[PDB]
Design a protein around this ligand. Structure first.
Ligand SMILES: O=C(N[C@H](CO)[C@H](O)c1ccc([N+](=O)[O-])cc1)C(Cl)Cl
Ligand SMILES: [Pr+3]
Ligand SMILES: [Pr+3]
Length: 387
């Protein structure tokens, strides 16, 4: 009778995710409205993700000391305010700063929201909620760009931010009445020296770092495609909004297909064999995209096929590498999760920006060549990581 709590956390999580996914196709309308160059399109996502890594390391220990309730509720409010505030941005620089401020809201989901879930419910009921949250993460990158392309076809980009704020408001009120206080160290002081030392400690573990870096590198081509596909397809190939959306279907559908095969194979395959199994489509897909576009710069259908094959591999291999990276360090899971989360976002932010310059200077060929080296770096780390 009190399932309002995990339900409203799912709603909030969903809203921060479309806070990125719906926005990207709208970015072409944003830069036209500010009369800014196309180079600002991928940067919207870069700033959002950079904000997502800013406070990651702090919120867990802090909410443990002052309460999961006030910290979680504060994050929801912060998202509401920054979503509305971007309506007042006067140039693309100001717009990009607010994307960064919005992205900080991402830190509250894992470090305090999910921490509260694990502390409240039975381990059997905890699996049901976790699975549901995983479903949302899988559905957002498919539906997001589709709904976002449909939105700006009829409605202003500003309207999307009003929608994000509204969904988060509903989420606030449910959390305000249903979230219990579960923080275990209320009243205790926080030492930033002890906290910083815990992070130096996790980063000393070479096998943990290899796994965490590998997760960043291997996912980068997907994230770069989310960031840049509007300018690649619409301004680069001179195609329509409809085709932009159509090309998302084989890519994110393959990702889903990869995850469903994972579920069917899990009882009769170890984590290690699934990573190796995914490596074939990961490497072949990225090779196909690169070879085709070097031969012919405008072979965007070959590019899309290569990325779908690669995306299938990710669906099969990623969750297993997450699990193994998590247990590669014997330290507290709060510290480990936050560390691996920050390492992968560091790669995403820097990688998208490199990817942007690669595309601007050399087109689809360079875009896909850079994705290929990221695949090679994942593979290089797995030869070491797996033993
Ligand atoms: O895009 C992915 N998701 C992972 C983890 O969910 C990635 O770390 C990520 C996290 C948050 C995010 N966002 O809300 O902007 C995007 C990617 C795929 Cl690699 Cl599954
Ligand atoms: Pr310490
Ligand atoms: Pr400690």
């Amino acid at each position: 009778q009190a399932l309002l709590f995990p339900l409203c956390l799912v709603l909030y999580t969903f809203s921060t995710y479309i806070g990125n996914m719906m926005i990207q196709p709208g970015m072409l309308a944003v830069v036209e409205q500010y009369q800014a160059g196309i180079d600002w399109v991928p940067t919207s996502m870069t700033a959002y993700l950079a904000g997502g890594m800013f406070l990651q390391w702090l919120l867990g220990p802090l909410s443990d000391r002052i309460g999961r309730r006030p910290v979680m509720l504060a994050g929801v409010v912060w998202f509401i305010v920054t979503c509305l505030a971007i309506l007042l941005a006067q140039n693309i620089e100001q717009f990009t700063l607010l994307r960064f401020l919005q992205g900080i809201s991402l830190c509250f989901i894992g470090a305090v929201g999910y921490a509260a879930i694990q502390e409240s419910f039975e381990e059997a009921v905890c699996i049901k909620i976790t699975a549901l949250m995983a479903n949302v993460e899988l559905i957002a990158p498919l539906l997001g760009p589709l709904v976002g392309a449909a939105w700006i076809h009829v409605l202003p980009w500003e309207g999307m931010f009003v929608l994000f704020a509204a969904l988060a408001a509903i989420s606030f009120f449910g959390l305000q009445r249903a979230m219990p206080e579960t923080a275990t160290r209320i009243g205790e002081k926080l030492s930033l020296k002890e906290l910083g030392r815990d992070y130096k400690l996790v980063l000393k573990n070479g096998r943990f770092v290899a796994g965490a870096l590998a997760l960043g590198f291997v996912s980068l081509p997907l994230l770069a495609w989310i960031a840049q596909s509007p300018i690649i397809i619409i301004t680069g190939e001179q195609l329509s909004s409809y085709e932009y959306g159509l090309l998302q279907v084989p890519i994110f559908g393959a990702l889903i297909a990869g995850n469903l095969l994972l579920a069917r194979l899990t009882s009769r395959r170890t984590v290690r064999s699934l990573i190796i199994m995914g490596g074939w489509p990961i490497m072949i897909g990225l090779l196909v995209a690169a070879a085709a576009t070097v031969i012919s710069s405008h072979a965007y259908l070959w590019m899309t096929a290569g990325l779908s094959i690669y995306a299938f591999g990710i669906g099969l291999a990623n969750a297993g590498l997450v699990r193994l990276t998590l247990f590669a360090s014997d330290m507290s899971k709060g510290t480990v999760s936050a560390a691996m989360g920050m390492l992968q976002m560091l790669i995403f932010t820097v990688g998208i920006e490199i990817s942007k310059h690669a595309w601007l200077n050399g087109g689809n060929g360079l875009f896909n060549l850079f994705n290929l080296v990221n695949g090679i770096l994942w593979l290089s780390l797995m030869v070491i990581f797996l033993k």
